[PDB]
Amino acid sequence: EEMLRKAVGKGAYEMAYSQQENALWLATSQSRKLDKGGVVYRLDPVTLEVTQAIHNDLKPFGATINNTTQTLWFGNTVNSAVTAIDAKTGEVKGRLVLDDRKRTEEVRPLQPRELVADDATNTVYISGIGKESVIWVVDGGNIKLKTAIQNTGKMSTGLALDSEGKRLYTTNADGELITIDTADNKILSRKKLLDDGKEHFFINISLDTARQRAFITDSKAAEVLVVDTRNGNILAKVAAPESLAVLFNPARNEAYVTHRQAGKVSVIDAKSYKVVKTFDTPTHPNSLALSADGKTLYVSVKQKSTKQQEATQPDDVIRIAL
């Protein structure tokens, strides 16, 4: 039983793991006022040492990997764009702006948040957030846009994919869960999960296609929801601090959840729907990543850092031996 916490860089965010390359990648936006653009770090799965540092014109935040084409996709939040990088060589394949509009007092260009790649059809799904969000469907072949699934709602940040079942889910700040047919990119349905009049922001969603379950986090409630991907019925409400990121682990039938303010990572037993362990990870745990065999959990951890009183220390990645 080990826990290795190692420093990597400033502005740590999401990661992506690759069995083929036997590597983990970390997206970092670097220093906010001192750096222009950012860096995607290739880290050793065991020692967490940086084995490669990829410099990017645009700051990378969200990440995902297409295991078939061994291509990493990074969301460039502050530049409303997405980046493609070849995992094998670390070369920037190219970028595609998802919203060129200029920020004014009457316009908020949508910004990418989460990314999911359908290995089977080499498609990249990107959630574009704003007052009225969307879901850009990008072609991983030429890096050009195919279409923009409209009306996903307010701050529709969450995004999960069932490649085989051709179902693409997304959660939002309207307390909705939205199911989408990937075959025609059309919304099949949307249900308001809870109805206790309270405010709910379902930031993220991870799937367990095997049982057609979906683990959804809440940033405004102290409970992670487990939903039936077929009818949106609540299958369980796990008690935990307000959640952020969530990742389901088929190999151990359990889900990990990051609690930003709490500075904790929760281990939910997907059989009993009970928090069986809590990893203490201050200051602000951010994203999660799993080794191909689901034996190792990777957590990115951000330093306390106001955007007026920036952190002088680099963020860390915590490798946990599950």
Added chain:
Amino acid sequence: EEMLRKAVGKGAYEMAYSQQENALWLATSQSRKLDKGGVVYRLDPVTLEVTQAIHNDLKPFGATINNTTQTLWFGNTVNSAVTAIDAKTGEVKGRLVLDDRKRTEEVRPLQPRELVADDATNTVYISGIGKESVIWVVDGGNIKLKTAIQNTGKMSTGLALDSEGKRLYTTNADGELITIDTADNKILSRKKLLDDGKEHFFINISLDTARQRAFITDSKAAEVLVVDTRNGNILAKVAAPESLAVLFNPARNEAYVTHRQAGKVSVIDAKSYKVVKTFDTPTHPNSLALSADGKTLYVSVKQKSTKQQEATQPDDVIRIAL
């Protein structure tokens, strides 16, 4: 017709003029994060050149002069204390703490705001502000406290004196005007000047004993009030920006008023009760002072300066040829 604006120091506040010494004194608290204590500057009445700089252990804010004893009295706001300085030599005679309690989560030691000296009886009246203000009556002879007129109200900042009529007035944040017999230091009455349900903060009050009038400023209304010192009847409501400091000028039967945000100084004609002229004085005019013959007006002017983003420039004193 001239207007001379000259730099003096950081943290400018109140002034005091002396016919005998033919000088103006400016109280400055100096730099907020860089300086401990402050400086009282002796300035030439014409050129505004600093002819003497008095260093003080405690930062001076409010000021007043006892023309009989040629003694300057300075309120040390942040140290709940008052300072006596000999105008002739510039020597610090001594200090008297007006509230030694220590700042905690349940205690706000009262802080001196305004000061007035009764030349006839060598007494110094000091308004001590807080949730429930008071008025310290200090003995200008030994610098020891005589008593503390209690219950002046919430933020009873204003303070004026009719030495001959043994009447001491004070205004507060409860919209009250309070009359006090200096003979027994007892409150004779208190009236809520306006009754329009609106919030009123009568920050300052200057008197025209000759006609038993009182010019009172309002920091929450765009109108300076003129009151009858005998019955608190509104004698006039002059239209002007929200006011701060106010000074009546017997010699020209007019009153000057400082409008902090407005960056203006208003000249109110005390015969017609009309603003007959407005001196443009940005950024933040603070206090007023008059030459013994009421021919010259002196305004202290503070630079824009947040207490997190301090001003790099020193404040100015504007000498106006009325």
Added chain:
DNA sequence: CGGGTACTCAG
């Protein structure tokens, strides 16, 4: 996207 941090001789 639309309203809570610390300030204060400010009101």
Added chain:
DNA sequence: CGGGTACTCAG
């Protein structure tokens, strides 16, 4: 004294 500034990969 007791509630409005600018932040934002935050919720």
